[PDB]
């Protein structure tokens, strides 16, 4: 086409979606990870994760307001990944990299799994 | 912080949100523009437009499944702007620039208004 493009548009959209999350505006699901609860937007979860994409395209699960993750999933690893979904920023540290990689493999977040594998290979 | 960043994350999120829109997945509102109807995600509309941000943060309007725009709003101008919201791409042409600028001013999409003003000033 003959379209023009605004370079910062996608980043600005994601920044506003994170502002909505932080104020708990139009969040439509709570993700339960052991004792911890995380409010989010189903569409953002689907856009970032192969697992949530499969869950919320399912004709029955699409209507659930509560999703319980596998008890092996670490709440901190999930929190770091949820922050990444809404910001593009990953808080990857020596003390959390194993939990982050395991959570990203379960959530099917291919690019996060790839950087975790590379950072582990380096050490 | 000590975060790493995935450059393409925001663009990939927006691309997936547009894929959900195209398949009518988890759309939660219909925007009525004269006779024309447009399905969308309230969160994406809010993230892109000062007008939708004001509408869906209102305690009563946040629950509406149908929003009717002012009858002066042109459906084609709206369609071009809705496509921009989900892609960062603006189909700006000599034949639509006046309708696009008027719709962007009404929707409070400051960056679109700015490029329309510049393209009009050039001609």
């Amino acid at each position: 086409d003959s379209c023009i493009q605004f370079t910062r548009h996608a980043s600005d959209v994601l920044l506003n979606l994170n502002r909505l999350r932080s104020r708990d505006i139009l969040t439509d699901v709570v993700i339960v990870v052991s004792r911890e609860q995380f409010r989010a937007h189903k569409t953002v979860l689907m856009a970032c994760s192969g697992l949530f994409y499969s869950i919320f395209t399912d004709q029955l699960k699409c209507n659930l307001s509560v999703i319980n993750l596998d008890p092996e999933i670490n709440p901190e690893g999930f929190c770091i990944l949820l922050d990444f979904m809404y910001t593009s920023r990953l808080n990857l540290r020596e003390g959390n990299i194993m939990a982050v990689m395991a959570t990203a493999m379960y959530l099917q977040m291919e690019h996060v799994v790839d950087t975790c594998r590379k950072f582990i290979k380096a050490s | 912080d000590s975060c790493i960043q995935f450059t393409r994350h925001a663009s990939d999120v927006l691309l997936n949100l547009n894929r959900l829109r195209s398949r009518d997945i988890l759309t939660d509102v219909v925007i009525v523009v004269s006779r024309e109807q447009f399905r969308a995600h309230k969160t994406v509309l809010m993230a892109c437009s000062g007008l939708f941000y004001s509408i869906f943060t209102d305690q009563l309007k946040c629950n509406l499944s149908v929003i009717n725009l002012d009858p002066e709003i042109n459906p084609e101008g709206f369609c071009i702007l809705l496509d921009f919201m989900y892609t960062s791409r603006l189909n700006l042409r000599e034949g639509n620039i006046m309708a696009v600028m008027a719709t962007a001013m009404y929707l409070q999409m400051e960056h679109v208004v700015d490029t329309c003003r510049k393209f009009i000033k050039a001609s």
Partner: peptide, 4 residues
């Protein structure tokens, strides 16, 4: 704005 750019030419994509």
């Amino acid at each position: 704005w750019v030419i994509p």
